[PDB]
Amino acid sequence: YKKIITSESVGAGHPDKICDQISDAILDECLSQDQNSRVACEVLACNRLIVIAGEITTHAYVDVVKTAWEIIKPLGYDENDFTIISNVNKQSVDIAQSVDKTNKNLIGAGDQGIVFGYACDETPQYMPLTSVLAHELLKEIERQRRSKEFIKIQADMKSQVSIDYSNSTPLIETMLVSIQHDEDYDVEYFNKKVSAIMEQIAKKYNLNTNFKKIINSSGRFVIGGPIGDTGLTGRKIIVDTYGGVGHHGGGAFSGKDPTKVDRSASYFARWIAKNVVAAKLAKQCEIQLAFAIGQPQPVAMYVNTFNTNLIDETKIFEAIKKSFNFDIKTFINDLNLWTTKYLPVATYGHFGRDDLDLSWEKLNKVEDLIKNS
Amino acid sequence: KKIITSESVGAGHPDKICDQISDAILDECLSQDQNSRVACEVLACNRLIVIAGEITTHAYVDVVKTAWEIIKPLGYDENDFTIISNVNKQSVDIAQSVDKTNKNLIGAGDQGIVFGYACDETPQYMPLTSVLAHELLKEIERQRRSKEFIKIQADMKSQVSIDYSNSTPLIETMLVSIQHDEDYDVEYFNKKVSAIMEQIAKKYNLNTNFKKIINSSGRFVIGGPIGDTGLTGRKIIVDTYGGVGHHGGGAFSGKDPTKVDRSASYFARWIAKNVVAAKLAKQCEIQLAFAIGQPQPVAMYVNTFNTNLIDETKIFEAIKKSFNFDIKTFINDLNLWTTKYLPVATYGHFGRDDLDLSWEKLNKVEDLIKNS
Amino acid sequence: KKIITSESVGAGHPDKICDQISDAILDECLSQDQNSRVACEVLACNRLIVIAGEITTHAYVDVVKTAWEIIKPLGYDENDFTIISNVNKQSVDIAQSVDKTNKNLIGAGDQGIVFGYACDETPQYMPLTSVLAHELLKEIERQRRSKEFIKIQADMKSQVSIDYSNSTPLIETMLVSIQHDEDYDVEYFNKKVSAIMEQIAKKYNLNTNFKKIINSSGRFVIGGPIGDTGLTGRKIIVDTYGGVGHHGGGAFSGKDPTKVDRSASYFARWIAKNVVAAKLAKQCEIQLAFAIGQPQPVAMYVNTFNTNLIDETKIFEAIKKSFNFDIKTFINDLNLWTTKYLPVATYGHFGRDDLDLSWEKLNKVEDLIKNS
Amino acid sequence: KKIITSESVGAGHPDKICDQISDAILDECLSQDQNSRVACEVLACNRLIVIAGEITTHAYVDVVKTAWEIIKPLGYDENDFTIISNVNKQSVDIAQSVDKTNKNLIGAGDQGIVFGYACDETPQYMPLTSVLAHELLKEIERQRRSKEFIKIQADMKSQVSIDYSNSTPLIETMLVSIQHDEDYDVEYFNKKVSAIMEQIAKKYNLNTNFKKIINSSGRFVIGGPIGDTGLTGRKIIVDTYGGVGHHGGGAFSGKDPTKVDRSASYFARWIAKNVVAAKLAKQCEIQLAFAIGQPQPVAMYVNTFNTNLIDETKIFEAIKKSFNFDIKTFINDLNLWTTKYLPVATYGHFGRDDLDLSWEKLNKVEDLIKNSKH
Ligand SMILES: C[S@@+](CC[C@H](N)C(=O)[O-])C[C@H]1O[C@@H](n2cnc3c(N)ncnc32)[C@H](O)[C@@H]1O
Ligand SMILES: C[S@@+](CC[C@H](N)C(=O)[O-])C[C@H]1O[C@@H](n2cnc3c(N)ncnc32)[C@H](O)[C@@H]1O
Ligand SMILES: C[S@@+](CC[C@H](N)C(=O)[O-])C[C@H]1O[C@@H](n2cnc3c(N)ncnc32)[C@H](O)[C@@H]1O
Ligand SMILES: C[S@@+](CC[C@H](N)C(=O)[O-])C[C@H]1O[C@@H](n2cnc3c(N)ncnc32)[C@H](O)[C@@H]1O
Ligand SMILES: C[S@@+](CC[C@H](N)C(=O)[O-])C[C@H]1O[C@@H](n2cnc3c(N)ncnc32)[C@H](O)[C@@H]1O
Ligand SMILES: C[S@@+](CC[C@H](N)C(=O)[O-])C[C@H]1O[C@@H](n2cnc3c(N)ncnc32)[C@H](O)[C@@H]1O
Ligand SMILES: C[S@@+](CC[C@H](N)C(=O)[O-])C[C@H]1O[C@@H](n2cnc3c(N)ncnc32)[C@H](O)[C@@H]1O
Ligand SMILES: C[S@@+](CC[C@H](N)C(=O)[O-])C[C@H]1O[C@@H](n2cnc3c(N)ncnc32)[C@H](O)[C@@H]1O
Ligand SMILES: [K+]
Ligand SMILES: [K+]
Ligand SMILES: [K+]
Ligand SMILES: [Mg+2]
Ligand SMILES: [Mg+2]
Ligand SMILES: [Mg+2]
Ligand SMILES: [Mg+2]
Ligand SMILES: [Mg+2]
Ligand SMILES: [Mg+2]
Ligand SMILES: [Mg+2]
Ligand SMILES: [Mg+2]
């Protein structure tokens, strides 16, 4: 009765991720010029067409076409490949009055919804091992593509990693990869390259190297990008988060300014959860926050430590409440979300990014949590 | 307090419009051609509806007429939206992998992970938070169309928080935001919603003393895609188990059954639901993983959350002997080529006692019982 | 030498595709609703076809299906173009002006100036340069469809220069550019075109020693909207009199008859053509001007170029007594609500001995003669 | 009674907006890259502006910012239109034909026929009907921007009918339709337009008793692309000679000078205008035809309408000795790579005494005179 858990990732060239990138590149340009921007940018990319839509109210001007090209050119496309449509509508004044309170010391929630923060002790990143390996696999392939160490491949790619959790020590069951390749590729070269990368990633995490490898199970993958499959913003929300190990309330991240609690509260919840595990109050922690549009604080909260709590759950809940300010305006500012760049997190997950220096990944609340328990 | 919260969205919500259109298109295709390959994605923003995705079909679907079928009942007309149709054709590199030469097997439409889930909390075998969230909006929409509830528009959301600290659940909070006319009467509006909140609570034998949050924005006249952009597959948690179950990431609407994101999810719900109805567990969650072109799942995990009535090993073993995991086989077993998907593009795909879905049938309890 | 030149373009030319689609749309509207107001403009550029304009109608036209009717014969398929449909309704401020309270009169759809023209040079009563330019491309397209001329595509142009120094006209130059396949045979292609050039010259009893310019680019494989953008109403001189006659500016395709740019131009051609057929002149040009909402022309000018057989005053006077200048009346006299316009969206709107156009009928010669 | 009529349209007219955007785009391209190949077509309908066409250039033009430059002065804002950009690349099969191996010649960008025209009726050497039609709308637009004429919008048309029965012309009718605000004052509106009609007539020493048609629709509040779709190159007669001259069909806006539809038309106007200013004819019309990839006209015809003051043979002969008909040469002679085209996308491309256009210069009169003597 093996216990096999599986998570996936997608590359920079994947059509859903292109949209996520463009949406966050646009957000970045807005916030860079106007830190009171309201931005809710959604992008569609389908065979020859990229539609840039959403609601924005901003003093900035963003050259939407130039921005799309910044993301698309490194993947291998040129200025004649896509028709670009710009349908940028302003934020609804009925929404704005509710978020931007008369009392300028409070920001009301950008929308209702539910978010989940999650953390665990399985990796240095405090993330499920399946997610971390899935992302690392694709990062390493993309890096080798750009360095030209791995040739005759294109940017569109997916990974799936199954891990065996039956014992105290995890075993990799299966590593799967689909990468878009050139017509004139060499399968032997391609297969040896991927395998070497699969083993290197396993060795780097001190794992077994005897796992089953599924390399390009379709048998052929030359048609790819938005030509092969349509892309949309926010259609990789589980890849963006915790790889199906954690729960998810439904909200997407990319293209959203921090007033959209779907994004800021999720980073806040990860911040809490991650620090809770780093403080060794639990092996795993999941935090659920719910919001109501226009209300400055969460409407409901739940902490779940999965029965891995080292101290009484009551004292964990109580430490969290005394160590964190749950006012939306306050946690936005505490996490420096108005000045953070989001493009780097539009690829390879928003969480456990030891390659980045994200505000919500900092273990700068362990002392307060410890002390308050 | 242990407070768990789920949400729902109405027929007029912009994400749900796109989901409706995507599934209305699928329906037309499959109705004409049951070997259609369909992966329709829709965007709706301000004055624009883009209909895109990959389709290979012998059918012809009048994409504009279809968009209107969905949009007219919400109150829009033929001059409100520019319609763009960008239908691409399924990639031949994908098709060769899915359609094996001998039609004996179908390979998986894509890699990924799906989750089925079921529990004993409701007659629908669904989390109470989800069920209440959906029922709330169904009842508002029904009253809107009957004209019992006036001066409201179709765009709406709900959020239901339930207290699970005790053996008997309590409703903590019911929240509703509904789009209203400029000349609405707030008193009328607030009394109407409250009555509906209590009726939904009474119908599930629940407490009636819960906090009510009604239009916390204070104004909600601009709505629809004018207020907020919509896209297909951006309501995947509302579509499924309201954040109580896990999710592997795949959306449902606009996809033919070769896309295992949809078919395997319905299959997993079918399994999980029958497991709970057979009383082998109070809750069950099944995770299946796929590889593109492979006819069976690549991995499987059953989790009963320590609510198993018999040995977990025997539950896993009963599932394996009671269900055929071949993709082509479970598609046919669930009648997915002939099922209509538009009715599930609103108000969740699971626990629909208002519908007659193949994957909601408790027709596998006997086989599961017998095989343990 | 007096060398006069006119051009034509083929069914596959991008401007003409738009003209075809615009008139195919009009046709569908009028076929269902003869009180349709239609002003359909179309753009076709590399992978995109935008269908726009103002329409008020009880009809429904499947704009995508219609675009395909026009594009399929040229060799395109259902995946070649993104279709955008942006059909806006007719302005109510315009409508009140055109549709008078008094239902006996229709006001002019817009201001502007139109020109009718006719001459005695051809059986069609059209300039010889125009007729030859159009015949050339018709014959190439017919041979393409019959498969007598292979390895060519539908996009093509012609230009015909004629020498008018003497009493008998001489062809100076015939020019043709046709889009060809990559693997075409130039020798075959050149012999084919030449034979067609000579056949067209022989059919009009003309010299056969003219210079031939065949595909002066040297290569013409990229064509259609991929090579060059197309728009409705960008072929107005090819549509009319090949630069021999004047033009006031208004385009024809996509317009219902309330748009005087179209109906008054056909009416002016009708007058002019009958004047020449009555032998009151060898050439005749009629200029009518309109004001929006006014049921009759605001100004009028007849020019017979000093080829008048009787006094000009008596020619003007015969015209006035032989024709009703009320807009509603000449629309009905010419049967414009029930005429099909797609056939005239290619190969000119005038002198179409291949068609049976109301405005080409010599049914006013007796009245003109009698009234002088 | 011999009544000739011409029309004009305003800055806010939907066809003209597209023409403006097309030429504003061209301008940006040429400003950055003088070897640009540009063929930009624009559609504007209801809430949508599509920017399409084929461009090969080292430039980058922010198409959205450019559309706004044109649309903001008319009264629109950044939320009014969905903008689509479908810029395609010039066809390499066309480019090889235009950009000859011999870098000293440019082949014609396309086949076609152009017409230059000039006459002695006005200081601009243009038909009186055209001049009056354009002046009327310029003066309305100027007053709109100065705020002398209020509660009007930029979309507008004019039509001027003139009586040519006698030696001295008479204005028959002046017509104007202007888009107005809902709360306008008709009396104010009618007095304003009339004053402008009379001022324009007096300025050309014409009669002032003509019939005035002012907003014959009775209502014109819905306007712009909302009221009526716009496309590039659907005002080719307003752009040229108001239906007095002939036209071969090609449009001007959005085209670089390799498109002979534009450059050869300016060249033909240049010739014709100088021919009339040299007093060799009262009216002159020049017809040039081209073949794609050929560096010179394929055919040429001068028509003086029997108004030639000297023998026609000597006129034809002077033209040939005074003008170089090589395409590359006349492009350079007219400075077409460095000319701005946005100013001519409104109020006609010809007889613009308000501008300094290369093709309006009477700098070939001396050579024509000199070459037409025995
Ligand atoms: C361009 S911005 C503001 C520009 C000006 N710089 C200012 O200070 O206000 C005004 C509106 O444009 C809309 N908009 C449309 N396209 C846009 C783009 N690419 N970048 C920014 N705003 C855009 C937004 O809705 C925004 O409220
Ligand atoms: C397989 S497609 C999914 C559905 C597709 N929309 C259709 O028409 O069936 C999803 C992903 O597969 C990857 N992909 C595309 N073609 C593939 C192929 N032939 N083999 C393996 N992977 C592929 C791309 O990254 C793409 O995002
Ligand atoms: C729609 S079918 C029509 C022909 C039909 N197979 C017959 O012969 O009876 C042709 C192809 O066009 C594409 N298509 C484009 N737009 C479509 C639409 N609106 N409805 C259906 N298919 C469309 C699909 O990719 C499909 O494979
Ligand atoms: C709040 S919006 C999302 C963000 C939005 N794109 C923006 O610019 O802020 C999401 C939903 O809220 C609901 N909604 C829109 N306007 C609202 C308002 N003024 N008050 C309450 N709910 C509203 C609609 O169902 C809509 O899909
Ligand atoms: C579409 S028709 C009536 C269609 C009919 N009720 C049906 O069931 O399909 C009525 C109005 O809608 C607008 N319209 C928008 N798109 C249209 C299309 N493709 N064909 C016809 N009318 C369209 C027109 O302006 C017209 O005045
Ligand atoms: C030459 S194009 C217009 C110029 C174009 N927009 C540019 O970027 O130069 C006009 C027409 O030429 C014809 N055409 C296209 N390519 C051609 C070629 N290589 N040789 C001759 N004719 C051609 C087609 O009929 C097309 O509509
Ligand atoms: C942007 S340009 C050249 C930019 C490049 N940095 C260079 O200097 O060569 C390359 C091509 O992009 C296409 N393009 C698409 N949109 C464009 C725009 N707004 N401006 C210029 N070119 C555009 C044109 O076909 C042009 O030839
Ligand atoms: C009236 S439209 C002609 C065709 C129009 N698409 C239709 O549906 O009938 C042409 C032009 O007239 C002007 N126009 C628009 N609305 C008008 C109105 N109500 N009365 C007079 N002129 C108008 C605008 O300049 C517009 O560019
Ligand atoms: K997709
Ligand atoms: K063109
Ligand atoms: K129009
Ligand atoms: Mg949300
Ligand atoms: Mg996707
Ligand atoms: Mg959404
Ligand atoms: Mg998926
Ligand atoms: Mg064209
Ligand atoms: Mg007109
Ligand atoms: Mg127009
Ligand atoms: Mg031309």
Residues C275, C281 contacting (CB under 8 angstroms): yes
CA–CA dist D119, D107 (Å, integer): 31
* Ligand 5 and C89: CB distance under 6 A: yes
β-bridge mates for residue A164, sequence order:
A4, A171
Strand intervals (E) in D190-250:
211-214, 230-231
Instruction: Centre a 10 Å sphere on the Cβ of residue C339 and count the other Cβ atoms it contains.
Output: 18
Nearest to A5 by CA among B108, B269, B107, B248: B248
C252–chain A nearest CA distance, Å: 29
Domain C100-127+260-372 is of which CATH architecture?
Answer: 2-Layer Sandwich (3.30)
- Which among B62, B82, B87 has the least Cβ separation from residue C62? B62
Q: H or E stretch including A266?
A: helix A261-278
The answer to whether residues B41 and B55 touch, using CB atoms and an 8 Å cutoff, is: no
Q: Is C191 in the pocket of ligand 5 (CB under 6 A)?
A: no
Give, in words, the CATH class of D100-127+260-374: alpha beta
To which residue do tokens 């969230």 refer?
Answer: B133
Backbone phi and psi for residue A173, each to the nearest 5 degrees, phi listed first: -90, -60
CB of A299 closer than 8 Å to CB of A352: no
Q: Positive or negative, the Cα torsion across D31, D33, D34, D36?
A: negative
Q: Rounded CA gap, D156 and D178, in Å?
A: 4
Partners of A89 on chain D (C-beta within 8 Å) are 79
Nearest residue to D127 (alpha-carbon basis) of D139, D119, D115: D119
List Cα–Cα distances, B236 to B233, B243, C48, D324, in angstroms: 6, 10, 32, 70
- The counts of H helices and E strands in chain C are 11, 11
**C-alpha B17 – ligand 9 centre gap (Å):** 17
CA distances (Å), C166 to each of B248, C171, C215, C308, D298, in order? 84, 12, 30, 20, 20
Compare CB distances from A230 to B2, B41, B316 and report the shortest one's residue: B41
3-state helix, strand, coil in chain B (%, to 5): 35, 25, 40
- DSSP helix/strand/coil, C255: strand
Query: Chain C partners of A78 at a C-beta cutoff of 8 Å?
Result: none
Name the packing angle between helices B63-71 and B14-32 (round to 10°): 130
Distance in Å, alpha carbon of C195 to nearest chain D alpha carbon: 21
Closest-lying ligand 2 atom to the alpha carbon of residue A223: 16
Q: Find residue D177's DSSP bridge partners.
A: D157
Phi, psi of B294 (to 5 degrees): -90, 130
Taking contacts as CB-CB distances below 8 angstroms, the residues of chain B near D46 are 82
Distance in angstroms (rounded) separating the CA atoms of residues C20 and C62: 15
- Determine the 3-state secondary structure of A370 from DSSP: helix
In this structure, what token pair is assigned to residue A186?
Answer: 């060499």
C75 is written with which tokens?
A: 């060799």
Q: In sequence order, which residues have a C-beta less than 8 Å from that of residue D168 and are 6 or more positions away?
A: none
CA distance A234 to A237: 6
For C89, how many CA atoms within 13 A lie in the half-sphere containing its CB? 14
| Partner A, chain B 152-191, Cβ-Cβ below 8 Å | 157, 159, 161, 172-173, 175, 177
Which bound ligand lies closest to the C-alpha atom of A19?
A: 13
* Cα-to-chain-centroid distance, residue C302: 22
Which DSSP state fits A74? G
CA geometry: angle D51, C79, C75, nearest 5 deg: 95
CA atoms in the 13 A half-sphere facing the CB of A109: 25
Identify the CATH class of A101-128+261-373: alpha beta
CA-nearest residue to B83 within chain D is D48
Instruction: Report d(CA A64, CA A85) in Å as an integer.
Output: 9
DSSP state of B99: B
- Tell me the C-alpha distance between C240 and B101, whole Å: 57
Q: What backbone torsions phi and psi does residue C365 show, to the nearest 5 degrees?
A: -60, -45
The domain B9-105+223-259: what is its CATH number? 3.30.300.10
- Separation of CA C253 and ligand 11 centre (Å): 10
Cα dihedral across residues D179, D180, D185, D191: positive or negative? negative
Q: Which residues pair with D299 in a beta bridge?
A: D289
Q: In whole angstroms, what is the distance from residue A315 CA to residue A302 CA?
A: 14
Q: How far apart are CA C336 and CA C19, in angstroms?
A: 18
Which residues neighbour A85 within 8 Å (Cβ) at sequence distance 6 or greater? A49, A50, A51, A52, A53, B50, B84, D82, D83, D84, D85
Resolution of this deposited model, Å: 2.6
> Å from A88 to nearest chain C CA?
18
* Alpha-carbon gap, residue B48 to A160, rounded angstroms: 36
Give the span between the Cα atoms of D146 and D179, in whole angstroms: 17
Q: Output the DSSP codes for B9-71.
A: E-TTSHHHHHHHHHHHHHHHHHHH-TT-EEEEEEEEETTEEEEEEEEE-S----HHHHHHHHH
3-state SS class at D40: strand
Quick one: which atom of ligand 8 is closest to the CA of D229?
6
What is the CB < 6 Å shell around ligand 8? C 37, 39, 54, 90-91, 93-94, 97, 109-110, 292; D 13-14, 155, 157, 177, 217, 219-220, 223, 227-228
Cβ B328 vs Cβ B105: under 8 Å: yes
The Cα–Cα gap between B264 and B249 comes to: 13
Q: Which CATH class is domain A10-100+224-260?
A: alpha beta
Query: Measured between CB atoms, which of D65, D82, D89 is closest to A80?
Result: D89
CA B352 to chain centre: 10
Spatial distance between the Cα atoms of D179 and D74, rounded to a whole number of angstroms = 12
Distance CA D64, CA A87 (A): 11
Token reading at A188: 């032997």
Structure tokens given for B183: 């000349």
For residue A181, the distance in angstroms to the closest alpha carbon of chain C comes to 24
Q: Determine the Cα–Cα distance for residues A342 and D98; give it in Å rounded to an integer.
A: 47
Question: How far, CA to CA in Å, does C111 sit from each of B338, C40, D14, D45, D221?
Answer: 57, 18, 15, 20, 17
Q: For residue B164, what are its two tokens?
A: 């699970």
Distance CA A197, CA A209 (A): 11
CA angle at A167 for the pair A163 and A169, rounded to the nearest 5°: 70
Tracing tokens 């596959």 back to the chain, one arrives at C12
Q: Which CATH number fits domain D9-99+223-259: 3.30.300.10, 3.40.50.1370, 3.30.360.10, 3.40.50.300?
A: 3.30.300.10
Q: How many CA atoms lie within 13 A of B241 on its CB side?
A: 30
Q: Domain locations in chain B?
A: 1-8+128-222, 9-105+223-259, 106-127+260-372
Angle between helices A64-72 and A15-33 (to 10 degrees): 130
Closest CA to A350 of A19, A50, A24: A24
Instruction: Report how far residue B362's alpha carbon sits from residue B273's, in angstroms, rounded to the nearest whole number.
Output: 7
* One-character DSSP codes across B148-187: SS-SEEEEEEEEEEEE-SSSS-EEEEEEEEEEE-TT--HH
Structure tokens at C287: 């200029």
Within 8 A by CB and 6+ apart from B152, the residues are B140, B144, B178, B179, B180, B181, B184, B189
Gap between the Cα atoms of B231 and A43, Å rounded:
9
The dihedral formed by the CA atoms of D350, D353, D354 and D357, expressed in degrees to the nearest 10: 60
What CA–CA distances, in Å, run from A280 to A15, A309, A311, A373?
Answer: 39, 8, 9, 11
Task: State the Cα angle at B42 between C56 and B139, rounded to 5°.
Answer: 90
**Which residues have CB under 8 Å from C151's CB, separation 6+?**
C180, C181, C183, C184, C185, C188, C189
Q: Who contacts C111 (Cβ-Cβ below 8 Å, separation ≥6)? A: C289, C290, C291, C292, D7, D157, D159, D175, D177, D216
Residue B119 near residue B127 (C-beta atoms within 8 A): yes
Asked if D371 and D323 count as a contact pair (C-beta separation under 8 A), the reply is no
Question: What is the DSSP annotation of D44-67?
Answer: EETTEEEEEEEEE-S----HHHHH
3-state secondary structure D273-324: HHHHHCCCECEEEEEEEECECCCCCCEEEEECCCCECCCHHHHHHHHHHHCC
CA separation, residue C233 to residues A91, A189, B182, B269, D236 (Å): 39, 56, 44, 58, 10
- CA A79 to ligand 7 centroid distance, Å: 6
- Please calculate the CA angle A124-A127-A131 and round it to the nearest 5 degrees: 115
| C-alpha distances in Å from residue D341, one per residue of A237, D98, D360 | 49, 22, 14
Residues A165 and A186: beta-carbon distance below 8 Å: no
Q: Which two tokens stand for residue D371?
A: 């070459």
SS3 content of chain C, % helix, strand, coil (to 5): 35, 25, 40
Q: Which residue of C has its CA nearest to A80?
A: C46
Distance CA B358, CA B336 (A): 8
**C125, C4 Cβ separation under 8 angstroms:** no
Whether B41 and A230 have beta carbons less than 8 Å apart is answered as yes
φ, ψ dihedrals at C345, nearest 5°: -70, -10
d(CA D292, CA D90): 14
Ligand 1 first shell, C-beta below 6 A: A 56-62, 64, 88, 90; D 78-79
**In chain C, which ranges are continuous DSSP H helix?**
14-32, 63-71, 92-98, 128-146, 186-203, 224-227, 236-239, 260-277, 312-322, 327-333, 365-370
Token pair 């030429």 is found at D23
Parallel, antiparallel or unpaired: strands D37-45 and D3-9: unpaired
DSSP secondary structure string for all residues of B102-145: STT-B-BSS-EEEEEEEESSSTTSS-HHHHHHHHHHHHHHHHHH
**Nearest C-alpha to atom 25 of ligand 7 is from which residue?**
D89
Nearest CA in chain C to A46: C82
Phi-psi region of B335 (alpha: psi -120 to 50; beta: other; left: phi over 0): left
Q: What is the dihedral of CA C188, C190, C194, C200, to 10 degrees?
A: 80
Determine the distance from the C-alpha atom of residue B43 to the mean position of all C-alpha atoms in its chain, rounded to a whole number.
Answer: 18
The rounded distance, in Å, linking the Cα atoms of C78 and C76 is 7
Distance D74 CA to ligand 11 centre (A): 18
Q: For ligand 5, is residue B78 a contact (CB within 6 Å)? A: yes
Strands of the D152-163 sheet, one edge to the other: D3-9, D152-163, D170-180, D211-214
Return the partners of chain C (3 or more C-beta pairs < 8 Å). A, B, D
Contact yes or no for D159/C111 (Cβ under 8 A): yes
Could you report how far apart the first and last alpha carbons of chain A are, in Å? 39
Q: Residue A156 — φ and ψ, nearest 5°?
A: -75, 130
CA–CA separation, D328 and D296 (whole Å) = 9
Identify whether the C-beta of residue A81 lies closer than 8 Å to the C-beta of residue A45: no
Under an 8 A CB cutoff, do C231 and D234 touch? yes
Answer whether A370's CB lies under 8 Å from A146's CB.
Answer: no
Q: In what order do the strands lie in the sheet containing C299-303?
A: C112-119, C283-290, C299-303
CA of C357 to the centre of ligand 2 (A): 54
Torsion from C-alpha of A318, A323, A326, A328, nearest 10 degrees:
-170
H or E segment to which residue B188 belongs = helix B186-203
Which residues fall within 8 angstroms of residue C370, CB to CB, at 6 or more apart? Answer: none
Residues in chain C, total = 372
Q: Which of D57, D62, D90, D94 best tests ligand 7's pocket when mutated (most atoms within 8 Å of CB)?
A: D57
Kindly determine whether residue A294 and residue B237, on different chains, have CB atoms separated by under 8 Å: no
In DSSP terms, which residues pair with C173 in a beta bridge? C161, C211
D79 touches chain A (CB under 8 A): yes
The tokens for C218 are: 């040297």
Q: Is residue A339 within 8 angstroms of chain D, CB to CB?
A: no
Please give the Cα distance from B366 to C174 (Å, whole number).
Answer: 85
Which two structure tokens, joined as six digits, stand for D345? 């996308």
Map residue B223 onto helix, strand or coil. coil
Answer whether C89 touches B (CB < 8 Å).
Answer: yes
Q: Which fold has domain B106-127+260-372?
A: GMP Synthetase; Chain A, domain 3 (3.30.300)
Measured CA to CA, the distance from residue B74 to residue B69 in angstroms comes to 10
Query: CB atoms < 10 A from the CB of C26, how many?
Result: 28
C107 lines ligand 6 (CB under 6 A): no
CA of C95 relative to ligand 8 center, distance in Å: 10
- Measuring CA to CA, how many Å separate D93 from each of B321, C213, D292? 65, 17, 11
Nearest Cα to Cα of residue B136 among B196, B211, B214, B216: B196
Chains with ≥3 Cβ pairs under 8 A against A?
Answer: B, C, D
- Residue among B288, B308, B309, B285 at smallest CA distance from B297: B288
Q: Which of C137, C177, C182, C234 to mutate to test the pocket of ligand 6 (most atoms within 8 A of CB)?
A: C177
What method did the depositors use to determine the structure? X-ray
Distance from CA of A50 to the nearest CA of C (A): 12
Radius of gyration (C-alpha) of chain A in whole angstroms: 21
DSSP state of C106: B
Contacts of residue A172, Cβ cutoff 8 Å, sequence gap at least 6? A133, A161, A162, A163, A164, A202, A207, A208, A211
Q: How close is the Cα of B50 to the center of ligand 18, in Å? A: 27
Chain A: closest CA distance from residue B215 (Å): 8
Tokens of B234: 């951006």
Element (H, E) at A284: strand A284-291
Round to whole Å and give the CA distance between C124 and C277.
10
Q: In whole angstroms, what is the distance from residue A179 CA to residue A341 CA? A: 28
How many angstroms is it from B114 CA to the middle of ligand 15?
Answer: 8
Which ligand minimizes its atom distance to the CA of B55? 3
Cα first-last separation, chain C: 37
